[PDB]
């Protein structure tokens, strides 16, 4: 059980049973003594999982079209930085088949259904496999564990059929996510100070590591 910056508070509750546990909570945020909304340790674990997964997707998709745009078959009209995609209009914008606000309403609808039902599995497990949902209900009954509902939709290949491999793959998902969150954070700060996109920034550091934007600390759009 490797421990990183543990404390007497942290080791009082961080048991090692939680996937990815290194006994690290110097602020005692997962302390089970005082518990109201959103300071439940369970909620913080499910939150680290969800933030981690979304951060994997974003860490990939933010740098992907730039890289493929460097040397690849993607049209350079569509190969941009993540922040010039139209996400941030003053950083850059692109005209899609929609006005980017209708895109936002649409995505908030779809994410509306997915996220609302996900939450209903958190608040009442298995409640999403009962009311008529044009089928699909069976995979929406959940595994009893909200972060890991599995079933046919979310775990069709059923990796980690034994508890050992599932626990190792959970440790893996946790560290993968903790890496991806720091990744997208790095995209934020790099694109903030550098402004050329994360991969082009890395390349500015490749041919010339002596570049080292740290000491420069210059910023332009």
Partner 1 sequence: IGSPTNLIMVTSTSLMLFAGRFGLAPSANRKATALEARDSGLQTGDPAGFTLADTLACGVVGHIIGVGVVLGLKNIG
Partner 2 sequence: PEVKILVDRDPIKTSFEQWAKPGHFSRTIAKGPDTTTWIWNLHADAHDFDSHTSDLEEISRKVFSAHFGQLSIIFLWLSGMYFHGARFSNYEAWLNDPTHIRPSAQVVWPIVGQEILNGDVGGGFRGIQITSGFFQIWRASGITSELQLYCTAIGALVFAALMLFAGWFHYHKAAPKLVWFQDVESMLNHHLAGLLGLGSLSWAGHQVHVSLPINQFLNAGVDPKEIPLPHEFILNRDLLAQLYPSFAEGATPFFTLNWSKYADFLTFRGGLDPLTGGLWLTDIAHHHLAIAILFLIAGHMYRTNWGIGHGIKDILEAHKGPFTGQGHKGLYEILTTSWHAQLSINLAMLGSLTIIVAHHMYAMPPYPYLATDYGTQLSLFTHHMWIGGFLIVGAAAHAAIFMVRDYDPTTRYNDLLDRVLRHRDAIISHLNWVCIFLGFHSFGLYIHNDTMSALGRPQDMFSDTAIQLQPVFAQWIQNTHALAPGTTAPGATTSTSLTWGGGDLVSVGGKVALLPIPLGTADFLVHHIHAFTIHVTVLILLKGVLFARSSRLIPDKANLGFRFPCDGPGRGGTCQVSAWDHVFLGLFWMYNAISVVIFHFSWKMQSDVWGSINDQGVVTHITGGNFAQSSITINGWLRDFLWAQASQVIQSYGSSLSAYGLFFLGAHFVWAFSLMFLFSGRGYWQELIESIVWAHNKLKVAPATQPRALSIVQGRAVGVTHYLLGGIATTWAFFLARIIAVG
Partner 3 sequence: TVAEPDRPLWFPGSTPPPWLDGSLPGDFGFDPLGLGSDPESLRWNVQAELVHSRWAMLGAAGIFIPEFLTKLGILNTPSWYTAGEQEYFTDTTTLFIVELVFIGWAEGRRWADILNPGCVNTDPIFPNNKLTGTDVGYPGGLWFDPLGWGSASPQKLKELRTKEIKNGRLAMLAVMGAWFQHIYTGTGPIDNLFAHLADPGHATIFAA
Q: Annotated binding residues for chlorophyll b, as ranges?
A: 4, 53, 88, 115, 118
In the complex, the smallest distance separating the C-beta of residue 185 from ligand LUT, rounded to whole angstroms, is 4
Task: Give the residue from 94, 55, 51, 82 showing the smallest Cα distance to 201.
Answer: 82
**Residue 104 CA, distance from chain mean position:** 19
- Round to whole Å and give the CA distance between 96 and 88: 14
- Site membership for partner 1, residue 8 (CB under 8 A): yes
**Tokens for 125?**
């497990």
Q: Packing angle between helix 163-193 and helix 41-70, nearest 10 degrees?
A: 60
- Site membership for ligand CLA, residue 50 (CB under 6 A): no
In the complex, the smallest distance separating the C-beta of residue 26 from partner 2, rounded to whole angstroms, is 8
Tokens 């997962």 belong to 30
Sites for partner 3 among residues 132-171 (CB under 8 A): 132-133
Choose from partner 1, Ca ion, partner 3, none: what does 6 bind? Cβ within 5-8 Å by kind: partner 1
Instruction: Tell me the residue length of the chain.
Output: 221
In the complex, the smallest distance separating the C-beta of residue 25 from partner 1, rounded to whole angstroms, is 11
Q: Cβ contacts of residue 48 below 8 Å, gap of 6+?
A: 20, 174, 177, 178
- 68 to 107: interface string for Ca ion, x by CB under 5 A: ----------------------------------------
Sites for partner 2 among residues 87-126 (CB under 8 A): 90
Residues of the shown chain interacting with Ca ion in the complex, contacts defined by CB under 5 A:
31, 34, 39
């Amino acid at each position: 059980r490797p421990l990183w910056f543990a404390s007497k508070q942290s080791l009082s509750y961080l048991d090692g049973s939680l996937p990815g546990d290194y006994g690290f909570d110097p602020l005692g945020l997962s302390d089970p003594e005082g518990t109201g909304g959103f300071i439940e340790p369970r909620w913080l674990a499910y939150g680290e999982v969800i933030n981690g997964r979304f951060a994997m997707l974003g860490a990939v998709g933010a740098i992907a079209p730039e890289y493929l745009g460097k040397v690849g078959l993607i049209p350079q009209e569509t190969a941009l930085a993540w922040f010039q995609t139209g996400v941030i209009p003053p950083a850059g914008t692109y005209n899609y088949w929609a006005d980017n606000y209708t895109l936002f309403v649409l995505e908030m609808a779809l994410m509306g259904f997915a996220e609302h039902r996900r939450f209903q599995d958190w608040a009442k497990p298995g409640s999403m496999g009962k009311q008529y949902f044009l089928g699909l209900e069976k995979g929406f009954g959940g595994s009893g564990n909200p972060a890991y509902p599995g079933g046919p939709f979310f775990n069709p290949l059923g990796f980690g059929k034994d508890e050992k491999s599932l626990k190792e793959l959970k440790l893996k998902e946790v560290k993968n996510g903790r890496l991806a969150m720091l990744a997208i954070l790095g995209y934020f700060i790099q694109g903030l100070v550098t402004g050329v996109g994360p991969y082009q920034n890395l390349l500015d550091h490749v041919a010339d590591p002596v570049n080292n934007n740290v000491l420069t600390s210059l910023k332009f759009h």
